[PDB]
Amino acid sequence: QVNTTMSVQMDKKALLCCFSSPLINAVLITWIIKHRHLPSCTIAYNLDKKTNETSCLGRNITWASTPDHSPELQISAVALQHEGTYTCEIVTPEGNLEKVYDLQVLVPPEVTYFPGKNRTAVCEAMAGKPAAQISWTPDGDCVTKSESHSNGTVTVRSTCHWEQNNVSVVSCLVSHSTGNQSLSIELS
Ligand SMILES: *[C@@H]1O[C@H](CO)[C@@H](O)[C@H](O)[C@H]1NC(C)=O
Ligand SMILES: *[C@@H]1O[C@H](CO)[C@@H](O)[C@H](O)[C@H]1NC(C)=O
Ligand SMILES: *[C@@H]1O[C@H](CO)[C@@H](O)[C@H](O)[C@H]1NC(C)=O
Ligand SMILES: *[C@@H]1O[C@H](CO)[C@@H](O)[C@H](O)[C@H]1NC(C)=O
Ligand SMILES: *[C@@H]1O[C@H](CO)[C@@H](O)[C@H](O)[C@H]1NC(C)=O
């Protein structure tokens, strides 16, 4: 329930801090990783016996470094499969402690822009997470179509037409939390 929401972009490295203190007497540290559909996996470290185990092979999930006073999980390269709950269960001589992360994966859209026939322009934001928002300058008569994909990404495709014959150059803004992208299009 009490958790840290964390947003990480595709292909970037993510670091999930369990705690950072020389005072916490951790005997065993376990990360439990849960997904909506994908099966769960675990990385565990025995600080007493200096031994470790993993059921996360092929998921690019490891200990950032050997855990001591700053136990930290590392995702070397974030991918859609990484979205889920990351729970750090700490066993100390006094009892149990926990740190929960809710990891969200952001996918930047792949954009394209092009003029069409009869003073139309097309702006597309391919497979973004969340869906990108497309806006035009100046205002046109547009049709925007969004397609949700099974991986959680959304493709947005916009086609406009401008009445005013004083309009020769149009601008498309593709807004996204990972960064805005805009380009101007010369009408036919
Ligand atoms: C994390 O906390 C937020 C805000 O309270 C909540 O919306 C979300 O569902 C929680 N997630 C988990 C995995 O507990
Ligand atoms: C964890 O286990 C793997 C496989 O047994 C090992 O290669 C790795 O060095 C261990 N990690 C740490 C932080 O000791
Ligand atoms: C693991 O990450 C590396 C880059 O650090 C990447 O080349 C590889 O394809 C990734 N493997 C999986 C299964 O995600
Ligand atoms: C998500 O699905 C779309 C549509 O199949 C695909 O174009 C895109 O490459 C996928 N995204 C990722 C990050 O796998
Ligand atoms: C991206 O564009 C939107 C819409 O104009 C704006 O609200 C937002 O501040 C922009 N983001 C950045 C980082 O400039």
166 lines ligand 1 (CB under 6 A): no
User: Residue 36's CB: how many other CB atoms inside 10 A?
Assistant: 8
Residues 91 and 129 reside in one and the same domain: no
Q: Point out the ligand nearest to the CA of residue 52.
A: 2
Q: Cα 108 vs. chain centroid, distance in angstroms? A: 9
Which residues precede gaps in the chain, with C-N > 2.5 A?
none
Does one domain contain both 91 and 164?
no
Residues 93 and 113 in one domain: no
Dist. CA 64 → ligand 5 center (Å): 34
This structure was determined by: X-ray
* One domain, residues 10 and 97: yes
| Beta strands across the sheet bearing 61-63 | 14-17, 72-75, 61-63
128, 90: one domain: no
120 CA distance to ligand 5 centroid (A)? Answer: 25
139 and 99 share a domain? no
Expressed as residue numbers, the domain containing 4 is 1-107
> What length does the chain have?
188
Q: What is the CATH number for 156?
A: 2.60.40.10
Query: b/e map of 144-176 (b: 16 or more CB within 10 Å)?
Result: eeeeeeeeebbbbbbbbbbeeeeeeebebebeb
Which region holds residue 58: left if phi is over 0, alpha if psi is between -120 and 50, else beta? Answer: left
In terms of domains, do 99 and 147 share one? Answer: no
Stated as kind and residue range, the H or E segment containing 180 is: none
How many domains in the chain?
2
Q: Which atom of ligand 3 is nearest to the CA of 58?
A: 13
Q: Is 21 helix (H, G, I), strand (E, B) or coil?
A: coil
Q: Point out which residues pair with 53 in neighbouring strands.
A: 44
Residue 107 near ligand 4, beta carbon < 6 Å: yes
Q: 45: exposed, middle or buried (C-beta count within 10 Å: 0-12, 13-18, 19+)?
A: buried
Same domain, residue pair 75 and 164: no
Structure tokens at 103: 């990891």
* 133-137, strands of its sheet edge to edge: 133-137, 169-175, 181-186
Nearby residues of 37 by Cβ (< 8 Å), 6 or more positions away: none
Exposed, middle or buried, 116 (CB in 10 Å: 0-12/13-18/19+)? middle
